[PDB]
């Protein structure tokens, strides 16, 4: 469905990022590729086609490449205004049509990284007798401000129902984020227990509660 | 200059149509594959749909084919998109995109609009 | 410390939308009054002087008023590119320097409004454990996308260890945030119940919950 | 054209000192007043400190007096703000304004900086 991208990465200014994106056969083997770049609330823009040319208005530190079945972004000398999201895309065979990688997130960092504390937290007793049963899994004072959350329902992973909000920078310069998962009450004593895992470039912590 | 304009972005019911337009000025639309690319809320890129500057060829992606409908006027300068049977998981913002090339073979998509928005409910 | 303004308003493409600032005797009175505007992630912009002068590059449905201890920002036709973010702002004799308005935000509506869901959770029994009592109040499905948040411990107001997350679009377009509130495993058994009450376009809702 | 670009900002500890500088272009600084503008994270617009164009009149925002210190160099077409036994409530966005006039008399600021991050831990 996707091509394979790193969620996020960074770099210190005037540093050398890469970024990766891998396909298959029926992709970026036969078919070359292009990068687009996006700033937040904007559309996206085209930085790079036919697998290594630059359109005209993009800076020369900006150079792509394609090896087998996977491609390659380089920026070197990172600049503040590099902040943003980039996505690999190609033909594919066998979708007949576009496919696009998942996007990977780039900082310049200003200030030192940062592991997300998390908690869990069971459904409220008043929304209970609403006939209602959220779960809320908080994540705070992690830098850079960008995460990936996945749910389990004992020990299935559940993708009905679950929202995470786009992180957001607080009073001491780290983000924020909160995800919240809609049961019913049933759903909820139905299963031993339920699990919020967190991913911060490339680590994870997993939180666990149950019916008391 | 190059510039494209979409217009039809309404919130509806769930099961309705919905008929989206895209204007194109500052160039030669007949020479160009168009296609429509969205965006659901702090997700990816998906790829919609795709035609070349004879609509004679047309592909879709997975989630919309048989639903969605993709056609041009090449005198009008606008490409169209017709959506049936909406489902909450069209929710997103719609793009149109303009290729170098006059086929759609490619991912190579130089222009983009700004977007409209869809709600379903 | 501040100028009065309203946090929020709206209306629709092609309406008339104002904005106010009230002052005293101390700023707006005596000295005239500018206004600024601020898209997300960008520096502010002078859009008026000197009560009712526009700079060059505004357009000319932007107009300003000034009456008595009070002034106003009125924008005929709206457009989608005036979402943004308004100050006032007035130089003030007691301060000896500049005072500003608090912000108002103002949205340009393309769906039904909608007021929010609230859910206030208590603290979990792993991080009390830990020595941590941290209570998470739970704001979803509001439009548009801007909110006030106050908490109340028994019926005192408490400002130390507040934090709001900047509300985010979920995948039906709606709008959603979180507020969390850092307390010790002492504080919260010190008092008979604490209260999260969130104000959406000048309406209140308010939640209430007390250790079990 | 007319530019003002700020540098300085960095992570510091509580109860630490830091200087930031303003540099500007494009206009000649010794006739206009200056002064400094910050912004915390979610929140608004807070005054700090402003000056005349000739140095001789200073004044500050309630939060900072005492603690920061505004100074220029009209030759070196330099701005500067000291900063002392800073606190948590510093951590913000300061930004580099400046005046249509001569004089720190009014709250009108024509040009603004893009800014710099302090962050106090
Ligand atoms: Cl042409
Ligand atoms: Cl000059
Ligand atoms: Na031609
Ligand atoms: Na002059």
């Known amino acids: 469905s996707v091509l394979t991208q790193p969620p996020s990465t960074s770099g210190t200014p005037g540093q050398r990022v890469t970024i990766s994106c891998?396909?298959?056969?029926?992709?970026?083997?036969?078919?070359?590729?292009?990068?687009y770049q996006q700033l937040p609330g904007t559309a996206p823009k085209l930085?790079?086609?036919?697998?290594?040319?630059?359109?005209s208005g993009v800076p020369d530190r900006f150079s792509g490449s394609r090896s087998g079945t996977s491609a390659s972004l380089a920026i070197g000398g990172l600049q503040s205004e590099d902040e943003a999201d980039?996505?690999?895309?190609?033909?594919?065979?066998?979708?007949?049509?576009?496919?696009?990688?998942?996007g990977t997130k780039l900082t310049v960092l200003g200030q030192p990284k940062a592991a997300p504390s998390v908690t869990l937290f069971p459904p409220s007793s008043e929304e209970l007798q609403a006939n209602k049963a959220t779960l809320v899994c908080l994540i705070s004072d992690f830098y850079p401000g960008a995460v990936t959350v996945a749910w389990k329902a004992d020990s299935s992973p559940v993708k009905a129902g679950v929202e995470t909000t786009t992180p957001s920078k607080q009073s001491n310069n780290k983000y924020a984020a909160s995800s919240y998962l809609s049961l019913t009450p049933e759903q909820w004593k139905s299963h031993k227990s339920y699990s919020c895992q967190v991913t911060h470039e490339g680590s994870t912590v997993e939180k666990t509660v149950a019916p008391t | 200059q190059v510039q494209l304009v979409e217009s039809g972005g309404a919130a509806v019911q769930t099961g309705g149509s919905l008929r989206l337009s895209c204007?194109?000025?500052?160039?030669?639309?007949?020479?160009?594959?168009?296609?429509?690319v969205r965006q659901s809320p702090g997700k990816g890129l998906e790829y919609?749909?795709?035609?070349?500057?004879?609509?004679?060829?047309?592909?879709?992606?997975d989630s919309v084919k048989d639903r969605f409908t993709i056609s041009r006027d090449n005198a009008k300068s606008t490409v169209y998109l017709q959506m049936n049977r909406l489902e909450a998981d069209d929710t997103a913002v719609?793009?149109?995109?303009?290729?170098?090339?006059?086929?759609?073979?490619?991912?190579?998509?130089?222009?983009?609009?700004?977007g409209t928005q869809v709600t379903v409910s | 410390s501040v100028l009065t303004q309203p946090p929020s308003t709206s209306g629709t493409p092609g309406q008339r939308v104002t904005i106010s600032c009230s002052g005293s005797?101390?700023?707006?009175?005596?000295?005239?009054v500018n206004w600024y505007q601020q898209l997300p992630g960008t520096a502010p912009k002078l859009v008026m002087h000197?009560?009712?002068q526009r700079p060059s590059g505004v357009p000319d449905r932007f107009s300003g008023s000034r009456s008595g201890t009070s002034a106003s920002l009125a924008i005929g036709g709206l457009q989608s590119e005036d979402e943004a973010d308004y100050f006032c702002?007035?130089?003030?004799?007691?301060?000896?320097?500049?005072?500003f308005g608090g912000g108002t935000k103002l949205t340009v509506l393309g769906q039904p409004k909608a007021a929010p869901s609230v859910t206030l959770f208590p603290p979990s029994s792993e991080e009390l454990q830990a020595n941590k009592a941290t209570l998470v109040c739970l704001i979803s499905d509001f439009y548009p996308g801007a909110v006030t948040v106050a908490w109340k411990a028994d019926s005192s107001p408490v400002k130390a260890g507040v934090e709001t997350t900047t509300p985010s679009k979920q995948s039906n377009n709606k709008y959603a945030a979180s507020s969390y509130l850092s307390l010790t495993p002492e504080q919260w058994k010190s008092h008979k119940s604490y209260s999260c009450q969130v104000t959406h376009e000048g309406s209140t809702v308010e939640k209430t919950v007390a250790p079990t | 054209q007319v530019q003002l670009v700020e540098s300085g900002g960095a992570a510091v500890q509580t109860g630490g000192s830091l200087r930031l500088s303003c540099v500007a272009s494009?206009?000649?600084?010794?006739?206009?007043?200056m002064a400094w503008v910050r912004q915390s994270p979610g929140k608004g617009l807070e005054y700090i400190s402003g000056?005349?164009?000739?140095?001789?009149?200073?004044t500050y925002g309630d939060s900072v007096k005492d603690r920061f210190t505004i100074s220029r160099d009209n030759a070196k077409s330099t701005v500067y703000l000291q900063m002392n036994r800073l606190e948590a409530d510093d951590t913000a966005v300061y930004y580099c304004?400046?005046?249509?006039?001569?004089?720190?008399?009014?709250?009108?600021?024509?040009?603004w900086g893009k800014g710099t991050q302090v962050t106090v831990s």
């Open positions: 304004v400046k005046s249509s006039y001569s004089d720190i008399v009014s709250a009108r600021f024509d040009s």
């Open positions: 494009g206009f000649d600084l010794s006739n206009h007043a």
């Open positions: 000056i005349n164009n000739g140095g001789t009149t200073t």
């Open positions: 005797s101390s700023n707006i009175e005596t000295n005239t």
């Open positions: 000197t009560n009712n």
């Open positions: 702002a007035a130089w003030d004799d007691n301060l000896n320097g500049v005072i």
